[PDB]
PDB file of all heavy atoms in Angstrom:
ATOM      1  N   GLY A  27     124.736  98.429  77.287  1.00 30.48           N
ATOM      2  CA  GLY A  27     125.174  97.281  76.519  1.00 30.48           C
ATOM      3  C   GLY A  27     126.670  96.936  76.744  1.00 30.48           C
ATOM      4  O   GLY A  27     127.331  96.371  76.037  1.00 30.48           O
ATOM      5  N   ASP A  28     127.021  97.254  78.075  1.00 32.28           N
ATOM      6  CA  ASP A  28     128.396  96.912  78.446  1.00 32.28           C
ATOM      7  C   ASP A  28     128.639  95.624  79.302  1.00 32.28           C
ATOM      8  O   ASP A  28     129.745  95.129  79.407  1.00 32.28           O
ATOM      9  CB  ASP A  28     128.898  98.086  79.452  1.00 32.28           C
ATOM     10  CG  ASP A  28     128.033  98.323  80.594  1.00 32.28           C
ATOM     11  OD1 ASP A  28     126.867  98.836  80.454  1.00 32.28           O
ATOM     12  OD2 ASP A  28     128.307  97.865  81.745  1.00 32.28           O
ATOM     13  N   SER A  29     127.491  95.174  79.895  1.00 34.96           N
ATOM     14  CA  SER A  29     127.593  93.841  80.590  1.00 34.96           C
ATOM     15  C   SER A  29     126.307  93.261  80.868  1.00 34.96           C
ATOM     16  O   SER A  29     125.292  93.807  80.695  1.00 34.96           O
ATOM     17  CB  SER A  29     128.237  94.175  82.059  1.00 34.96           C
ATOM     18  OG  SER A  29     127.394  95.021  82.809  1.00 34.96           O
ATOM     19  N   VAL A  30     126.469  91.880  81.286  1.00 33.78           N
ATOM     20  CA  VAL A  30     125.206  91.067  81.569  1.00 33.78           C
ATOM     21  C   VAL A  30     125.226  90.869  83.100  1.00 33.78           C
ATOM     22  O   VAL A  30     126.156  90.496  83.624  1.00 33.78           O
ATOM     23  CB  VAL A  30     125.388  89.712  80.868  1.00 33.78           C
ATOM     24  N   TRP A  31     124.169  91.239  83.655  1.00 34.93           N
ATOM     25  CA  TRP A  31     124.054  91.348  85.109  1.00 34.93           C
ATOM     26  C   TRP A  31     123.493  90.007  85.803  1.00 34.93           C
ATOM     27  O   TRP A  31     123.829  89.509  86.761  1.00 34.93           O
ATOM     28  CB  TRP A  31     123.034  92.315  85.678  1.00 34.93           C
ATOM     29  CG  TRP A  31     123.577  93.806  85.260  1.00 34.93           C
ATOM     30  CD1 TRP A  31     124.822  94.153  84.860  1.00 34.93           C
ATOM     31  CD2 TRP A  31     122.861  95.030  85.542  1.00 34.93           C
ATOM     32  NE1 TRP A  31     124.848  95.549  84.734  1.00 34.93           N
ATOM     33  CE2 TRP A  31     123.690  96.138  85.162  1.00 34.93           C
ATOM     34  CE3 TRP A  31     121.541  95.305  85.987  1.00 34.93           C
ATOM     35  CZ2 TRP A  31     123.292  97.387  85.148  1.00 34.93           C
ATOM     36  CZ3 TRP A  31     121.181  96.651  86.168  1.00 34.93           C
ATOM     37  CH2 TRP A  31     122.031  97.681  85.728  1.00 34.93           C
ATOM     38  N   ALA A  32     122.671  89.225  84.952  1.00 35.09           N
ATOM     39  CA  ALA A  32     122.152  87.842  85.339  1.00 35.09           C
ATOM     40  C   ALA A  32     121.675  87.293  84.132  1.00 35.09           C
ATOM     41  O   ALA A  32     121.222  87.790  83.188  1.00 35.09           O
ATOM     42  CB  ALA A  32     121.119  88.043  86.332  1.00 35.09           C
ATOM     43  N   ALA A  33     121.636  85.794  84.152  1.00 37.80           N
ATOM     44  CA  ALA A  33     121.161  84.993  83.058  1.00 37.80           C
ATOM     45  C   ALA A  33     120.818  83.586  83.461  1.00 37.80           C
ATOM     46  O   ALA A  33     121.468  83.041  84.487  1.00 37.80           O
ATOM     47  CB  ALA A  33     122.208  84.993  81.947  1.00 37.80           C
ATOM     48  N   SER A  34     119.979  82.949  82.819  1.00 37.31           N
ATOM     49  CA  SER A  34     119.626  81.620  83.104  1.00 37.31           C
ATOM     50  C   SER A  34     120.607  80.577  82.382  1.00 37.31           C
ATOM     51  O   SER A  34     121.318  80.916  81.571  1.00 37.31           O
ATOM     52  CB  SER A  34     118.109  81.261  82.597  1.00 37.31           C
ATOM     53  OG  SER A  34     117.983  81.513  81.138  1.00 37.31           O
ATOM     54  N   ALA A  35     120.425  79.346  82.728  1.00 37.15           N
ATOM     55  CA  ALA A  35     121.523  78.277  82.275  1.00 37.15           C
ATOM     56  C   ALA A  35     121.406  78.091  80.836  1.00 37.15           C
ATOM     57  O   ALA A  35     120.208  77.670  80.332  1.00 37.15           O
ATOM     58  CB  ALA A  35     121.239  77.060  83.037  1.00 37.15           C
ATOM     59  N   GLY A  36     122.444  78.291  80.058  1.00 37.98           N
ATOM     60  CA  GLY A  36     122.503  78.004  78.737  1.00 37.98           C
ATOM     61  C   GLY A  36     122.335  79.316  77.811  1.00 37.98           C
ATOM     62  O   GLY A  36     122.835  79.339  76.618  1.00 37.98           O
ATOM     63  N   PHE A  37     121.663  80.210  78.340  1.00 38.68           N
ATOM     64  CA  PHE A  37     121.122  81.475  77.611  1.00 38.68           C
ATOM     65  C   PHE A  37     122.322  82.461  77.616  1.00 38.68           C
ATOM     66  O   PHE A  37     122.305  83.559  78.306  1.00 38.68           O
ATOM     67  CB  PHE A  37     119.929  81.914  78.340  1.00 38.68           C
ATOM     68  CG  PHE A  37     119.051  82.877  77.437  1.00 38.68           C
ATOM     69  CD1 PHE A  37     118.723  82.418  76.230  1.00 38.68           C
ATOM     70  CD2 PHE A  37     118.631  84.008  77.906  1.00 38.68           C
ATOM     71  CE1 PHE A  37     117.834  83.189  75.257  1.00 38.68           C
ATOM     72  CE2 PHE A  37     117.736  84.911  77.068  1.00 38.68           C
ATOM     73  CZ  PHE A  37     117.474  84.441  75.896  1.00 38.68           C
ATOM     74  N   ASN A  38     123.363  82.235  76.887  1.00 39.43           N
ATOM     75  CA  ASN A  38     124.677  83.031  76.882  1.00 39.43           C
ATOM     76  C   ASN A  38     124.347  84.095  75.817  1.00 39.43           C
ATOM     77  O   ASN A  38     124.577  83.790  74.479  1.00 39.43           O
ATOM     78  CB  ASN A  38     125.745  82.217  76.619  1.00 39.43           C
ATOM     79  CG  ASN A  38     125.834  81.049  77.626  1.00 39.43           C
ATOM     80  OD1 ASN A  38     125.263  81.148  78.727  1.00 39.43           O
ATOM     81  ND2 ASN A  38     126.641  80.006  77.364  1.00 39.43           N
ATOM     82  N   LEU A  39     124.377  85.399  76.260  1.00 35.13           N
ATOM     83  CA  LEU A  39     124.338  86.471  75.376  1.00 35.13           C
ATOM     84  C   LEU A  39     125.868  87.140  75.312  1.00 35.13           C
ATOM     85  O   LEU A  39     126.363  87.404  76.283  1.00 35.13           O
ATOM     86  CB  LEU A  39     123.430  87.542  75.911  1.00 35.13           C
ATOM     87  CG  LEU A  39     121.964  87.096  76.254  1.00 35.13           C
ATOM     88  CD1 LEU A  39     121.223  88.387  76.675  1.00 35.13           C
ATOM     89  CD2 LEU A  39     121.341  86.416  75.044  1.00 35.13           C
ATOM     90  N   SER A  40     126.269  87.363  73.964  1.00 35.69           N
ATOM     91  CA  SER A  40     127.646  87.929  73.889  1.00 35.69           C
ATOM     92  C   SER A  40     127.617  89.374  73.897  1.00 35.69           C
ATOM     93  O   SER A  40     126.656  90.073  73.696  1.00 35.69           O
ATOM     94  CB  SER A  40     128.145  87.471  72.375  1.00 35.69           C
ATOM     95  OG  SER A  40     127.307  88.005  71.380  1.00 35.69           O
ATOM     96  N   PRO A  41     128.882  90.026  74.108  1.00 38.28           N
ATOM     97  CA  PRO A  41     129.041  91.340  74.246  1.00 38.28           C
ATOM     98  C   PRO A  41     128.521  92.094  72.988  1.00 38.28           C
ATOM     99  O   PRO A  41     127.820  93.171  73.043  1.00 38.28           O
ATOM    100  CB  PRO A  41     130.577  91.641  74.204  1.00 38.28           C
ATOM    101  CG  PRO A  41     131.074  90.359  74.893  1.00 38.28           C
ATOM    102  CD  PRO A  41     130.235  89.283  74.395  1.00 38.28           C
ATOM    103  N   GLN A  42     128.862  91.472  71.716  1.00 35.76           N
ATOM    104  CA  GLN A  42     128.359  91.986  70.561  1.00 35.76           C
ATOM    105  C   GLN A  42     126.784  92.009  70.481  1.00 35.76           C
ATOM    106  O   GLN A  42     126.174  93.015  69.941  1.00 35.76           O
ATOM    107  CB  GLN A  42     128.952  91.230  69.400  1.00 35.76           C
ATOM    108  CG  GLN A  42     130.540  91.335  69.227  1.00 35.76           C
ATOM    109  CD  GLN A  42     131.263  90.490  70.212  1.00 35.76           C
ATOM    110  OE1 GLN A  42     130.872  89.714  70.977  1.00 35.76           O
ATOM    111  NE2 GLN A  42     132.614  90.587  70.078  1.00 35.76           N
ATOM    112  N   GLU A  43     126.120  90.939  70.887  1.00 37.27           N
ATOM    113  CA  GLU A  43     124.729  90.838  71.011  1.00 37.27           C
ATOM    114  C   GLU A  43     124.068  91.877  71.865  1.00 37.27           C
ATOM    115  O   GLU A  43     123.114  92.589  71.438  1.00 37.27           O
ATOM    116  CB  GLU A  43     124.311  89.365  71.385  1.00 37.27           C
ATOM    117  CG  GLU A  43     124.415  88.354  70.188  1.00 37.27           C
ATOM    118  CD  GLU A  43     124.172  87.006  70.745  1.00 37.27           C
ATOM    119  OE1 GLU A  43     124.091  86.730  71.970  1.00 37.27           O
ATOM    120  OE2 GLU A  43     124.031  86.076  69.786  1.00 37.27           O
ATOM    121  N   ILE A  44     124.571  92.007  73.056  1.00 35.73           N
ATOM    122  CA  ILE A  44     124.054  93.061  74.054  1.00 35.73           C
ATOM    123  C   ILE A  44     124.226  94.488  73.558  1.00 35.73           C
ATOM    124  O   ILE A  44     123.440  95.479  73.721  1.00 35.73           O
ATOM    125  CB  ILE A  44     124.459  92.759  75.496  1.00 35.73           C
ATOM    126  CG1 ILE A  44     125.885  93.088  75.683  1.00 35.73           C
ATOM    127  CG2 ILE A  44     124.161  91.387  75.884  1.00 35.73           C
ATOM    128  CD1 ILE A  44     126.340  93.128  77.162  1.00 35.73           C
ATOM    129  N   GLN A  45     125.493  94.641  72.944  1.00 34.45           N
ATOM    130  CA  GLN A  45     125.719  96.058  72.267  1.00 34.45           C
ATOM    131  C   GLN A  45     124.822  96.277  71.082  1.00 34.45           C
ATOM    132  O   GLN A  45     124.174  97.408  70.997  1.00 34.45           O
ATOM    133  CB  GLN A  45     127.235  96.006  71.761  1.00 34.45           C
ATOM    134  CG  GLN A  45     128.217  96.211  72.779  1.00 34.45           C
ATOM    135  CD  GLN A  45     129.623  95.783  72.580  1.00 34.45           C
ATOM    136  OE1 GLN A  45     130.032  95.894  71.420  1.00 34.45           O
ATOM    137  NE2 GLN A  45     130.406  95.369  73.544  1.00 34.45           N
ATOM    138  N   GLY A  46     124.507  95.192  70.318  1.00 33.51           N
ATOM    139  CA  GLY A  46     123.413  95.422  69.262  1.00 33.51           C
ATOM    140  C   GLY A  46     122.062  95.621  69.857  1.00 33.51           C
ATOM    141  O   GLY A  46     121.330  96.545  69.258  1.00 33.51           O
ATOM    142  N   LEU A  47     121.647  94.959  70.830  1.00 33.30           N
ATOM    143  CA  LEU A  47     120.293  95.116  71.416  1.00 33.30           C
ATOM    144  C   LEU A  47     120.155  96.515  72.037  1.00 33.30           C
ATOM    145  O   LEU A  47     119.204  97.161  71.761  1.00 33.30           O
ATOM    146  CB  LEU A  47     119.893  93.970  72.373  1.00 33.30           C
ATOM    147  CG  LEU A  47     118.619  94.025  73.078  1.00 33.30           C
ATOM    148  CD1 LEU A  47     117.472  93.720  72.089  1.00 33.30           C
ATOM    149  CD2 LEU A  47     118.557  92.975  74.072  1.00 33.30           C
ATOM    150  N   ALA A  48     121.253  96.927  72.707  1.00 35.79           N
ATOM    151  CA  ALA A  48     121.234  98.269  73.319  1.00 35.79           C
ATOM    152  C   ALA A  48     121.058  99.331  72.315  1.00 35.79           C
ATOM    153  O   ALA A  48     120.308 100.328  72.461  1.00 35.79           O
ATOM    154  CB  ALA A  48     122.511  98.493  74.237  1.00 35.79           C
ATOM    155  N   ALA A  49     121.905  99.228  71.222  1.00 36.40           N
ATOM    156  CA  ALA A  49     121.792 100.194  70.161  1.00 36.40           C
ATOM    157  C   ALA A  49     120.410 100.159  69.438  1.00 36.40           C
ATOM    158  O   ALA A  49     119.966 101.269  69.034  1.00 36.40           O
ATOM    159  CB  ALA A  49     122.875  99.891  69.113  1.00 36.40           C
ATOM    160  N   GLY A  50     119.839  99.055  69.416  1.00 35.29           N
ATOM    161  CA  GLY A  50     118.366  98.928  68.852  1.00 35.29           C
ATOM    162  C   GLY A  50     117.373  99.806  69.500  1.00 35.29           C
ATOM    163  O   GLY A  50     116.523 100.390  68.891  1.00 35.29           O
ATOM    164  N   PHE A  51     117.469  99.950  70.828  1.00 35.67           N
ATOM    165  CA  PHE A  51     116.506 100.861  71.644  1.00 35.67           C
ATOM    166  C   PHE A  51     116.656 102.161  71.226  1.00 35.67           C
ATOM    167  O   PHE A  51     115.709 103.026  71.376  1.00 35.67           O
ATOM    168  CB  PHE A  51     116.696 100.592  73.179  1.00 35.67           C
ATOM    169  CG  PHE A  51     116.096  99.287  73.519  1.00 35.67           C
ATOM    170  CD1 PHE A  51     116.924  98.213  73.964  1.00 35.67           C
ATOM    171  CD2 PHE A  51     114.793  99.065  73.611  1.00 35.67           C
ATOM    172  CE1 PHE A  51     116.290  97.009  74.239  1.00 35.67           C
ATOM    173  CE2 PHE A  51     114.221  97.920  74.046  1.00 35.67           C
ATOM    174  CZ  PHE A  51     115.031  96.861  74.358  1.00 35.67           C
ATOM    175  N   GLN A  52     117.962 102.639  70.869  1.00 37.20           N
ATOM    176  CA  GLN A  52     118.264 104.014  70.385  1.00 37.20           C
ATOM    177  C   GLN A  52     117.740 104.345  68.982  1.00 37.20           C
ATOM    178  O   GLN A  52     117.627 105.533  68.638  1.00 37.20           O
ATOM    179  CB  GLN A  52     119.756 104.247  70.402  1.00 37.20           C
ATOM    180  CG  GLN A  52     120.386 103.876  71.745  1.00 37.20           C
ATOM    181  CD  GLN A  52     121.940 103.944  71.673  1.00 37.20           C
ATOM    182  OE1 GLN A  52     122.651 103.788  72.700  1.00 37.20           O
ATOM    183  NE2 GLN A  52     122.453 103.922  70.453  1.00 37.20           N
ATOM    184  N   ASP A  53     117.444 103.222  68.145  1.00 40.32           N
ATOM    185  CA  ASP A  53     116.917 103.494  66.736  1.00 40.32           C
ATOM    186  C   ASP A  53     115.931 102.178  66.422  1.00 40.32           C
ATOM    187  O   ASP A  53     116.256 101.269  65.678  1.00 40.32           O
ATOM    188  CB  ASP A  53     118.019 103.563  65.750  1.00 40.32           C
ATOM    189  CG  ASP A  53     117.415 103.807  64.289  1.00 40.32           C
ATOM    190  OD1 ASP A  53     116.311 104.075  64.213  1.00 40.32           O
ATOM    191  OD2 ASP A  53     118.282 103.712  63.363  1.00 40.32           O
ATOM    192  N   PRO A  54     114.749 102.159  67.176  1.00 41.70           N
ATOM    193  CA  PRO A  54     113.899 100.988  67.096  1.00 41.70           C
ATOM    194  C   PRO A  54     113.439 100.589  65.666  1.00 41.70           C
ATOM    195  O   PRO A  54     113.634  99.349  65.383  1.00 41.70           O
ATOM    196  CB  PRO A  54     112.692 101.333  67.845  1.00 41.70           C
ATOM    197  CG  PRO A  54     113.263 102.451  68.901  1.00 41.70           C
ATOM    198  CD  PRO A  54     114.197 103.165  68.031  1.00 41.70           C
ATOM    199  N   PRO A  55     113.189 101.420  64.722  1.00 44.54           N
ATOM    200  CA  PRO A  55     112.854 100.998  63.421  1.00 44.54           C
ATOM    201  C   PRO A  55     113.918 100.108  62.647  1.00 44.54           C
ATOM    202  O   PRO A  55     113.608  99.199  61.955  1.00 44.54           O
ATOM    203  CB  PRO A  55     112.548 102.249  62.536  1.00 44.54           C
ATOM    204  CG  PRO A  55     112.168 103.244  63.517  1.00 44.54           C
ATOM    205  CD  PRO A  55     113.006 102.852  64.791  1.00 44.54           C
ATOM    206  N   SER A  56     115.180 100.362  62.952  1.00 42.68           N
ATOM    207  CA  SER A  56     116.259  99.589  62.416  1.00 42.68           C
ATOM    208  C   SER A  56     116.253  98.053  62.783  1.00 42.68           C
ATOM    209  O   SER A  56     116.711  97.192  61.994  1.00 42.68           O
ATOM    210  CB  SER A  56     117.600 100.142  62.962  1.00 42.68           C
ATOM    211  OG  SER A  56     117.841  99.730  64.295  1.00 42.68           O
ATOM    212  N   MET A  57     115.600  97.798  63.915  1.00 44.26           N
ATOM    213  CA  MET A  57     115.397  96.414  64.381  1.00 44.26           C
ATOM    214  C   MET A  57     114.594  95.528  63.333  1.00 44.26           C
ATOM    215  O   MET A  57     114.798  94.403  63.297  1.00 44.26           O
ATOM    216  CB  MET A  57     114.935  96.329  65.816  1.00 44.26           C
ATOM    217  CG  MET A  57     115.784  96.934  66.756  1.00 44.26           C
ATOM    218  SD  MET A  57     117.452  96.027  66.951  1.00 44.26           S
ATOM    219  CE  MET A  57     116.916  94.473  67.477  1.00 44.26           C
ATOM    220  N   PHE A  58     113.764  96.133  62.539  1.00 42.84           N
ATOM    221  CA  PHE A  58     112.970  95.383  61.780  1.00 42.84           C
ATOM    222  C   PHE A  58     113.753  94.836  60.585  1.00 42.84           C
ATOM    223  O   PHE A  58     113.630  93.636  60.111  1.00 42.84           O
ATOM    224  CB  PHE A  58     111.727  96.116  61.153  1.00 42.84           C
ATOM    225  CG  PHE A  58     110.685  96.301  62.109  1.00 42.84           C
ATOM    226  CD1 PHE A  58     110.489  97.467  62.903  1.00 42.84           C
ATOM    227  CD2 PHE A  58     109.850  95.273  62.329  1.00 42.84           C
ATOM    228  CE1 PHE A  58     109.423  97.460  63.739  1.00 42.84           C
ATOM    229  CE2 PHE A  58     108.790  95.227  63.297  1.00 42.84           C
ATOM    230  CZ  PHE A  58     108.557  96.362  64.001  1.00 42.84           C
ATOM    231  N   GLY A  59     114.805  95.600  60.067  1.00 41.18           N
ATOM    232  CA  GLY A  59     115.703  95.140  59.077  1.00 41.18           C
ATOM    233  C   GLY A  59     116.690  94.082  59.571  1.00 41.18           C
ATOM    234  O   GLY A  59     117.083  93.113  58.713  1.00 41.18           O
ATOM    235  N   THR A  60     117.194  94.218  60.683  1.00 42.89           N
ATOM    236  CA  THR A  60     118.262  93.387  61.249  1.00 42.89           C
ATOM    237  C   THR A  60     117.703  92.159  61.886  1.00 42.89           C
ATOM    238  O   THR A  60     118.355  91.071  61.904  1.00 42.89           O
ATOM    239  CB  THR A  60     119.152  94.104  62.320  1.00 42.89           C
ATOM    240  OG1 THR A  60     118.212  94.466  63.455  1.00 42.89           O
ATOM    241  CG2 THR A  60     119.696  95.379  61.858  1.00 42.89           C
ATOM    242  N   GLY A  61     116.573  92.153  62.443  1.00 44.38           N
ATOM    243  CA  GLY A  61     115.968  91.159  63.252  1.00 44.38           C
ATOM    244  C   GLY A  61     116.712  91.354  64.720  1.00 44.38           C
ATOM    245  O   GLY A  61     117.450  92.264  64.899  1.00 44.38           O
ATOM    246  N   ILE A  62     116.348  90.416  65.543  1.00 41.17           N
ATOM    247  CA  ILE A  62     116.812  90.426  67.004  1.00 41.17           C
ATOM    248  C   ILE A  62     117.784  89.288  67.074  1.00 41.17           C
ATOM    249  O   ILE A  62     117.278  88.050  67.088  1.00 41.17           O
ATOM    250  CB  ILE A  62     115.717  90.350  67.968  1.00 41.17           C
ATOM    251  CG1 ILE A  62     114.650  91.436  67.776  1.00 41.17           C
ATOM    252  CG2 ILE A  62     116.281  90.380  69.406  1.00 41.17           C
ATOM    253  CD1 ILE A  62     113.263  91.193  68.193  1.00 41.17           C
ATOM    254  N   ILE A  63     119.051  89.302  67.320  1.00 39.80           N
ATOM    255  CA  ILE A  63     120.001  88.293  67.508  1.00 39.80           C
ATOM    256  C   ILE A  63     120.396  88.122  68.895  1.00 39.80           C
ATOM    257  O   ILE A  63     121.139  89.023  69.437  1.00 39.80           O
ATOM    258  CB  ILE A  63     121.304  88.483  66.517  1.00 39.80           C
ATOM    259  CG1 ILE A  63     120.778  88.839  65.045  1.00 39.80           C
ATOM    260  CG2 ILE A  63     122.058  87.307  66.591  1.00 39.80           C
ATOM    261  CD1 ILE A  63     121.980  88.684  64.009  1.00 39.80           C
ATOM    262  N   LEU A  64     120.084  87.022  69.575  1.00 40.51           N
ATOM    263  CA  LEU A  64     120.376  86.698  70.931  1.00 40.51           C
ATOM    264  C   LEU A  64     120.555  85.207  71.150  1.00 40.51           C
ATOM    265  O   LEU A  64     119.977  84.455  70.600  1.00 40.51           O
ATOM    266  CB  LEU A  64     119.369  87.223  71.857  1.00 40.51           C
ATOM    267  CG  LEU A  64     118.911  88.674  71.830  1.00 40.51           C
ATOM    268  CD1 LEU A  64     117.614  88.946  72.356  1.00 40.51           C
ATOM    269  CD2 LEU A  64     120.012  89.635  72.580  1.00 40.51           C
ATOM    270  N   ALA A  65     121.669  84.919  71.833  1.00 37.61           N
ATOM    271  CA  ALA A  65     121.974  83.456  72.117  1.00 37.61           C
ATOM    272  C   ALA A  65     122.108  82.703  70.705  1.00 37.61           C
ATOM    273  O   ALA A  65     121.700  81.665  70.542  1.00 37.61           O
ATOM    274  CB  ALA A  65     121.061  82.799  72.972  1.00 37.61           C
ATOM    275  N   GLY A  66     122.847  83.362  69.791  1.00 36.80           N
ATOM    276  CA  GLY A  66     123.142  82.640  68.528  1.00 36.80           C
ATOM    277  C   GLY A  66     121.898  82.455  67.654  1.00 36.80           C
ATOM    278  O   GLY A  66     122.043  81.670  66.701  1.00 36.80           O
ATOM    279  N   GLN A  67     120.817  83.142  67.959  1.00 36.97           N
ATOM    280  CA  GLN A  67     119.483  82.877  67.244  1.00 36.97           C
ATOM    281  C   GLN A  67     118.972  84.183  66.754  1.00 36.97           C
ATOM    282  O   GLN A  67     119.050  85.211  67.437  1.00 36.97           O
ATOM    283  CB  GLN A  67     118.494  82.258  68.298  1.00 36.97           C
ATOM    284  CG  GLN A  67     117.305  81.695  67.648  1.00 36.97           C
ATOM    285  CD  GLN A  67     117.346  80.296  67.319  1.00 36.97           C
ATOM    286  OE1 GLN A  67     116.509  79.491  67.565  1.00 36.97           O
ATOM    287  NE2 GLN A  67     118.571  79.760  66.887  1.00 36.97           N
ATOM    288  N   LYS A  68     118.416  84.277  65.494  1.00 36.74           N
ATOM    289  CA  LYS A  68     117.800  85.456  64.999  1.00 36.74           C
ATOM    290  C   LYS A  68     116.334  85.259  64.915  1.00 36.74           C
ATOM    291  O   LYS A  68     115.820  84.327  64.256  1.00 36.74           O
ATOM    292  CB  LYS A  68     118.354  85.739  63.425  1.00 36.74           C
ATOM    293  CG  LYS A  68     117.623  86.859  62.877  1.00 36.74           C
ATOM    294  CD  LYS A  68     118.144  87.205  61.420  1.00 36.74           C
ATOM    295  CE  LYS A  68     119.490  87.997  61.520  1.00 36.74           C
ATOM    296  NZ  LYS A  68     119.769  88.758  60.298  1.00 36.74           N
ATOM    297  N   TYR A  69     115.662  86.310  65.618  1.00 37.11           N
ATOM    298  CA  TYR A  69     114.213  86.202  65.697  1.00 37.11           C
ATOM    299  C   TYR A  69     113.661  87.374  64.726  1.00 37.11           C
ATOM    300  O   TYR A  69     114.371  88.334  64.559  1.00 37.11           O
ATOM    301  CB  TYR A  69     113.727  86.649  67.163  1.00 37.11           C
ATOM    302  CG  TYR A  69     114.198  85.577  68.120  1.00 37.11           C
ATOM    303  CD1 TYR A  69     115.483  85.499  68.696  1.00 37.11           C
ATOM    304  CD2 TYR A  69     113.246  84.715  68.684  1.00 37.11           C
ATOM    305  CE1 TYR A  69     115.869  84.594  69.547  1.00 37.11           C
ATOM    306  CE2 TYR A  69     113.620  83.787  69.602  1.00 37.11           C
ATOM    307  CZ  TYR A  69     114.966  83.736  69.977  1.00 37.11           C
ATOM    308  OH  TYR A  69     115.288  82.779  70.907  1.00 37.11           O
ATOM    309  N   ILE A  70     112.427  87.067  64.223  1.00 38.43           N
ATOM    310  CA  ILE A  70     111.787  88.116  63.407  1.00 38.43           C
ATOM    311  C   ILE A  70     111.140  89.149  64.232  1.00 38.43           C
ATOM    312  O   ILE A  70     110.384  88.809  65.181  1.00 38.43           O
ATOM    313  CB  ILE A  70     110.669  87.359  62.634  1.00 38.43           C
ATOM    314  CG1 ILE A  70     111.291  86.321  61.623  1.00 38.43           C
ATOM    315  CG2 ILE A  70     109.775  88.489  61.937  1.00 38.43           C
ATOM    316  N   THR A  71     111.432  90.431  64.060  1.00 35.95           N
ATOM    317  CA  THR A  71     110.957  91.503  64.871  1.00 35.95           C
ATOM    318  C   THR A  71     109.442  91.686  64.651  1.00 35.95           C
ATOM    319  O   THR A  71     109.094  91.869  63.482  1.00 35.95           O
ATOM    320  CB  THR A  71     111.823  92.837  64.537  1.00 35.95           C
ATOM    321  OG1 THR A  71     113.093  92.497  64.752  1.00 35.95           O
ATOM    322  CG2 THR A  71     111.421  93.934  65.469  1.00 35.95           C
ATOM    323  N   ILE A  72     108.677  91.794  65.615  1.00 37.17           N
ATOM    324  CA  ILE A  72     107.244  92.082  65.572  1.00 37.17           C
ATOM    325  C   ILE A  72     106.817  93.379  66.294  1.00 37.17           C
ATOM    326  O   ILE A  72     105.740  93.864  65.932  1.00 37.17           O
ATOM    327  CB  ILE A  72     106.372  90.875  66.013  1.00 37.17           C
ATOM    328  CG1 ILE A  72     106.560  90.611  67.535  1.00 37.17           C
ATOM    329  CG2 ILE A  72     106.718  89.687  65.178  1.00 37.17           C
ATOM    330  CD1 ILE A  72     105.632  89.752  68.105  1.00 37.17           C
TER     331      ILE A  72
END
């Protein structure tokens, strides 16, 4: 969750977002409560 290695045009993920997503894999059930926040958008976790 320290850096972005590649990305498509417009699809800007912030340090805070990638840190959040990385932490999610370490405690997956927590993602249902938070949702998934990437590129300024919150998705419903399925």
